[PDB]
């Protein structure tokens, strides 16, 4: 009919969902100046990781069509 909620694309390009409903991100600091970093440090940043519990209030408000499950 009229207005529909719009997806915040800059957030959609940085957050996705697992099978159960967990939000995930990519850890930062792996685009330049990698020589001074140890392989242990660079390994930690390469891996995915669950997003902090405190930040979901901002993510979900920006991504309304993004199915999640806060109980997991």
């Amino acid at each position: 009919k009229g207005y529909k909620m719009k997806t915040h694309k800059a957030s959609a390009k940085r957050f996705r969902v697992t099978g159960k409903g967990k939000i995930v991100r990519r850890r930062a600091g792996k685009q330049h100046l990698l020589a001074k970093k140890n392989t242990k440090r660079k390994n930690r940043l390469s891996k995915l990781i669950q997003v902090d519990r405190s930040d979901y209030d901002n993510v979900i408000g920006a991504l309304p069509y993004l199915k999640v499950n806060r109980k997991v």
């Binding site: 390009k13 940085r14 920006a62």
Partner: protein, 184 residues
Amino acid sequence: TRFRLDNLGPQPGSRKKGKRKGRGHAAGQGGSCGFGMRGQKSRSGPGIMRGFEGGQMPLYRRIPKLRGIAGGMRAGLPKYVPINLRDIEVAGFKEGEEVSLESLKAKGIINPSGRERRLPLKILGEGELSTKLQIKARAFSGSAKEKLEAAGCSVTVLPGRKKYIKESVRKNLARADEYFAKKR
């Protein structure tokens, strides 16, 4: 009649009243309507953008983009309509029936719509089958072939859709096909 226009009413807890803010202090929400003293959240208009952090670099900027999505690589969608083996056992088929898209839609298990309509059917093989019927699907997984062939079923892979090929491309393939064939 027992029921009548003047003996009905709603179930309790189904229709709350609704807070009418700005109608005294005893009502609960005061004159300030539950927004505290003067500020930015208490003003009549659009508020801060969700994700805004007071000039601090928000989380949707100090985080790199997902792999592939950054440049424009298209995300991978499902190529088939996956159905496991256990669901077929629950459908309740007998020795003679087949298994296709048209059969499952009749039972009500598979109910595609839109993009999912123009997809073939694939079998996965998570379960067990002890009815010995025939299949008319497109693709099959490795575990499904071992179970169906062991249960005496009659699989049938469909040919699928054809891909157009340029003339000279057939000759290079025919060149190699003649090469392996004449040797082997």
